[PDB]
Design a protein around this ligand. Sequence first.
Ligand SMILES: [Ca+2]
Lengths: 390, 383, 390, 390
Amino acid sequence: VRIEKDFLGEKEIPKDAYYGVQTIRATENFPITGYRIHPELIKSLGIVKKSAALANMEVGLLDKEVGQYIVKAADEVIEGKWNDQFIVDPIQGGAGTSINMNANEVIANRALELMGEEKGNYSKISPNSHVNMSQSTNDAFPTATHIAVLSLLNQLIETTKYMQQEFMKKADEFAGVIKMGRTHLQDAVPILLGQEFEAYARVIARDIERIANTRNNLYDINMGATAVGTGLNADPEYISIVTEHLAKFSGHPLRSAQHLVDATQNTDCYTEVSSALKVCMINMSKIANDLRLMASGPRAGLSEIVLPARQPGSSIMPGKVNPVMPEVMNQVAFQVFGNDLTITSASEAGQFELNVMEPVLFFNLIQSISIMTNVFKSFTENCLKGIKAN
Amino acid sequence: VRIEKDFLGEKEIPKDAYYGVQTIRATENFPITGYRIHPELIKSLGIVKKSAALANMEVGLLDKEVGQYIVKAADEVIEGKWNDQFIVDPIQGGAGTSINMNANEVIANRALELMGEEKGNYSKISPNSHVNMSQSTNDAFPTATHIAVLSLLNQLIETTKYMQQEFMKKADEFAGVIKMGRTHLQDAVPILLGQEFEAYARVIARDIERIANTRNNLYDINMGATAVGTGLNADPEYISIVTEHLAKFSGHPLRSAQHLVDATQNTDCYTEVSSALKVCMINMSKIANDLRLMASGPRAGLSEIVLPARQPGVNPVMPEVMNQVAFQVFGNDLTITSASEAGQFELNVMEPVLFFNLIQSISIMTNVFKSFTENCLKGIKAN
Amino acid sequence: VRIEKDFLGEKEIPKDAYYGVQTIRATENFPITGYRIHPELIKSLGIVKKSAALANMEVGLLDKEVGQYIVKAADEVIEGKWNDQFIVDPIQGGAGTSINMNANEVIANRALELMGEEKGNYSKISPNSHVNMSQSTNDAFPTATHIAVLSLLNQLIETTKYMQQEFMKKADEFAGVIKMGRTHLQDAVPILLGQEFEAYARVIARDIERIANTRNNLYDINMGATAVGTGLNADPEYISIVTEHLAKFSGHPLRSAQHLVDATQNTDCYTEVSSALKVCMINMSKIANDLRLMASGPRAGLSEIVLPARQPGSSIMPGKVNPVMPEVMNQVAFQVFGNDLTITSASEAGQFELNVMEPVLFFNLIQSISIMTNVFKSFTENCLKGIKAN
Amino acid sequence: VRIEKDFLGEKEIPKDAYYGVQTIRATENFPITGYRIHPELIKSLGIVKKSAALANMEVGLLDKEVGQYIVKAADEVIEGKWNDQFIVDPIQGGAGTSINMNANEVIANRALELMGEEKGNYSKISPNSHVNMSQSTNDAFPTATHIAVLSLLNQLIETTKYMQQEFMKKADEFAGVIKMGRTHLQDAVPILLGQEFEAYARVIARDIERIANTRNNLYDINMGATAVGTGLNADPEYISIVTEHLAKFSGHPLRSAQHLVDATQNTDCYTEVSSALKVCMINMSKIANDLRLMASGPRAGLSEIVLPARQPGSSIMPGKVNPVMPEVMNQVAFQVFGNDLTITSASEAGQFELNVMEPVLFFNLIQSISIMTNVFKSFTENCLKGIKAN
Ligand SMILES: [Ca+2]
């Protein structure tokens, strides 16, 4: 039970909460889904504010006492101590303002608490003046995303490389086994089961390439572009220092865009990643369809392979064994195709020097990378490893 | 901590939890999203287990002493006491079995506790023999979904009607106000702002009608069709009783499907809805786009209307979030189409991702129409 | 080789051609697809102007001698005589202006040739002044399309009905044929093949139902809404009489829209049609995929049905006969899904009192309706009828 | 009128036609669209048959006298002599069998006409055995498509580089023109109009970049894979000698696939290209809308630019000039978005060692390429170049 001042009025924020009115206002405007932005987003949002204060202090804009406690409060956010304080819906108006401010206020209050000051006391440490210094919504939020995306994206590469490998092991394990090769679902010449499995592993290889390639256009950021991208009084030293600090703490080869308007209004580095992810899920779905057909039977199917039993067999009907792990892979592809349509749509919704539709674009981008990682990690383990011939 | 027995091995289910091995096995197979199924779906999933019990007691196949406590503990799930217990991922394999079984176990062990029995004792109360009696995955699950859809869907009709109304009032409020009508974004002739608003309000009317028509096909359910549709030993009396029970406890004019095979493999009743939803969000995204352009300025835009300030910079956040829900929906609909296309023979195993989105759409549309009418439409003014 | 005066310059119109400089400019602006607008649209686009002439004379705007020839010259276009003279791209800017002016020039110039005058001389008969009188692009063009769609939509209903019977015939023909009913592509409970074909029949019923209902919202036309919807000099006696002829000569129960601003700026009736078409071709694509699975083999398949062989693809492997007819269905399915996405994007693109993306919309809506009528026709005639149990 | 003998019956092919009974059977099975396959594909289909002959003569599998007349026949096809004789529908079952056989028959009956023989007499030159020797539908048809796409892609890149150029030119032209930079359609800071036309210029560069990288995976062909990908009597000399002939005449750095089984059944080269295309049209549509907003006016708009007039002022609203050329871009944009969804569905359809849905995939992929190149062409020439500030 507390009090905080907003232009709309005053909301009763709990004494526990590190978020303020600016976040509670977003709870009323956007009670759309209920979800919470991905933990890797929050981490990257923390990396951005820490990177900011470190740079702000170094150029003489931020008071070295107040900032020192913003850095420490930001490091706590990087480590995920405060994921229950980020309560704004991923789908939201204002083009990320609410997500940016939810970071600003949580780090603002927690920085006051460490230095022995009250929560909500914004005369001491303001979430706008001190935490959001030398930065807009339109560069913190993007850059955080760029970082969140890349990091998730690297996790996806490894988990996908590991999957690709385990297709090749199963490729040679069935080099000898011989099945009927089929075109138009209609019997052709006999074919080695191992060839089919190499065929899968070569396209997964080909995706891994495409996905990894989509990172390079994510390394260019616009931190310091501020409101539009002309700079609008944005110090060249601040840009350079916070860029280099963002590259350290995040760990990606991050840069500064050669045109900060271009990096602020265009959203093509995202459609690009989502496009590579769609084509990967096109392929895995086909393969998932193959696996389900080859596993068909026992008596009225193809009975070429046997998948690990991962769900209990029919009550009294014998031989009933559903291929649930491929099935779930088909469904994640259906999300990713959709996700990509929403992303395409939100990208087209660009107008002039900003695209205010980023929240849903980034929600679906992150979700795409996340569900793929997980199904690949669950599929390979509880299916690809155990797959045996008949 | 506890121990329960499954064909893979012996997992450790917390004693606080009412879910069993089947749910925790789902947790390892499908840690896809981390989401939970919608409360109204669980309620609906609880309206089916009650209707299933009452009928099997009415035809004598269920022990009336055990079934008595299956019913009452089901009603607890219908009133949302045990929403924490449903912990399977909406996107999942096995065409919904992990959701259905999650109800069976949570209902089973809470039934046990209400007749003073040990949790986990499936010799006393078996989730698959007792709770899942006369019913397969492929009718319990769909029928719950039908009910959960029609129910959620009714809140949307209402919330959209209200929204439609508040547009009609704004069309009256701007009946005299004059603005420049535009085609190709080029100046045409002046028209009345009220007309634009009535144009909007008339399509929202046309939408409400389109949405509402997609309920008809959704009333036809397949409870008692079991796994395929032929029935597989299915007692005709059971079907009749349980359907009538489901019509009472749901609140919808439900019917039993004429062709129980057709009601089990086809999934057009779901793509039909997504289409009515998509089309609504095509109309609303446009309108929102129109509203943002009208609110543009103050010095270098069109400056035709003034939206209530909701959030510090002032930006038109409410029409914006309308646009973004619209994009969500078109994408949800692509997913729903695919999942429906992927169908094979007597069962479309992709229903969970379809039923996850169809529900999501309905839910997020509802929620934004609410917020938008309230924190925007109502307070709109001319400049 | 002729000559005509446009604001850009002078182009040489062949003497054989009944179009003019307005059309040729559009041919130079939009060399995009190279396609021609669908004949039923050319037919319907003439029914519009014929009515517009009839009415404009009846209320005292057009000259009774000149309009006499516009009407008789429009009667020819309705019967298809000048399809060669509609050369403007279906994809075109100007919200369908060039399609409108193609009809106005085609008719005007033909009108002049009947009443012993020269083609090109618009002083006696103008496309803009006489043929396009009491109408802008934004009522003549949609109303044509409305009439086109409905006619092409009537054919699908009949062709889909006929198909739907022949599905039922086969489901009576397979009332006894036992086979394995499958779930998750696994074996379950033995079923009858007629029970499947009845399920195919019964959805296709539900498709015919859904598609039928889309017509209602199409019967509201916006003729006489002219430029915006306020009327802008719209004589109420013209609107009533023009609608009458339109409804009469077209066969449809066409109404007049209660709100001329609504019918001119909203496009939901199209997106409504489209989505019904998408749902239909989902079902069919599934029906296809099943058919092909049933028709697999001979020795490494399911071999549940034998489709009539309609072609050879057996140069490499002699004797192999594939399920081509279901295969083409799946493909026309995949078009309609795409077509639908365009129509969605196009609709959402509407700004204020006119939607300038209508042409690409209608191009896709008409194509969908046509390619469905066609492949349904050929699929029933060259596969469904001769299906036989194994 | 001619007589040719088929399984179904005996069709009456006109004597002046070069297509045979396989082609007319495809005309009756798939009367879907009426479109003809794109001329570059026709041409690319020819380059395939020439290189198939030349190699077959080099290893002595085909008769040198016959092959001589097959080569001369194909070379005429490559210059577009017989584009009229390719009457088959681009959407069709049999995984492209008809499109292949229509080449085989057009080429053979032309070859036979050159050497004095009668058309239809397949004893001398059999389209099936000779013209199509050592090559299946499943490598003849795609390798052509690869070549077709790669030829058509090299065009888009020029037309897009030349477009990007003219953006940069206007970007310098407006360097000192000041306008209001807007976020959320609300006023932000004043900005230079030239800075916007450089954000445009640059994204279009990043598009040229992505687009060109889709060419690599396209240079791997599968020629010699025949039916399944395991060769099936695929003479290693023939393979290599075919590849080099293809790379020669096409003018592409062509390679033989390391794994012909993978190459035959995976279809992710095309989805990768379509993915790029879409992203380009997202970026271009965004730009196209800005241009429509900037040119809005004259008295109740933004009036930031004037686009050259490309169509006459309206009949009802004298001197009203719409942004037609940017409108057609938006529409072609919307095409691709949907064409991609088709392509996506098509690839997904894939089952085992062949994707039978390639026909509607390549139709869309090629269209997207062609229609983009065409709207880019007319847009830079009839809009972007004459763009003037207010
Ligand atoms: Ca989605």
